[PDB]
Ligand binder design. Structure first.
Ligand SMILES: CC(=O)N1CCN(Cc2cccc(-c3cc4c(N[C@H](c5ccc6c(c5)S(=O)(=O)CCC6)C(C)C)ncnc4[nH]3)c2)CC1
Length: 167
């Protein structure tokens, strides 16, 4: 299905919309929804907490079972788990948190995880309280992702700065 609408195409493979990723996931029910995860898959705030709350904590129960069996992910790494009622699959991706001293080179590695899936609904990796320059995160996305990615950015002011810089 992947019925994305209202998206502005920036490149042959990158689209963007001023929207809440949770609301987009409920409407579209995409094949893959990307979560802006941490290495222990603990979804307490921001995007991760919003996606987990939309699943009524089912994402957290499943995440805890994955960590118990496989251990933590690494910064720049990912894992595929159920999307529950939001998507067929959830691709949990760990972008570097520069506000806590993690290296920005790892942002490229985090975006490279998107390439194993044909179509993804995703947030701007490492933006918000993760501390990275959001326009720089968009540049890395454009230069790294080669499959089709629909970026949901829930802030019209940020969306307008991204569309203006990209033009
Ligand atoms: C109608 C109603 O009451 N609502 C509204 C609330 N809605 C649920 C709801 C509640 C709370 C938050 C969010 C939401 C935040 C968010 C989003 N934020 C962006 C962003 C990008 C990357 C990262 C972060 C943030 S972070 O979380 O700071 C750190 C990780 C990396 C910023 C605009 C830069 N981008 C996309 N979708 C979103 N969703 C949503 C349920 C439905």
């Amino acid at each position: 299905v992947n019925s994305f609408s209202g998206y502005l195409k920036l490149t042959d493979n990158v689209y963007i919309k001023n929207a809440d990723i949770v609301e987009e996931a409920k409407k579209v029910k995409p094949t893959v929804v990307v979560n802006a995860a941490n290495v222990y898959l603990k979804h307490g705030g921001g995007v991760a907490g919003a996606l987990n709350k939309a699943t009524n904590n089912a994402m957290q129960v499943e995440s805890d079972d994955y960590i118990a069996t496989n251990g933590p992910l690494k910064v720049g790494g990912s894992c595929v788990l159920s999307g529950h009622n939001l998507a067929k699959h959830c691709l949990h991706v760990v972008g570097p948190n520069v506000n806590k001293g993690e290296d920005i080179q790892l942002l490229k590695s985090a975006y490279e995880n998107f390439n194993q899936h044909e179509v993804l609904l995703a947030p701007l990796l490492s933006a918000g309280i993760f501390g990275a320059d959001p326009i720089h995160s968009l540049r890395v996305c454009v230069d790294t992702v080669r499959t089709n990615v629909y970026l949901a950015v829930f802030d019209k002011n940020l969306y307008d700065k991204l569309v203006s810089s990209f033009l």
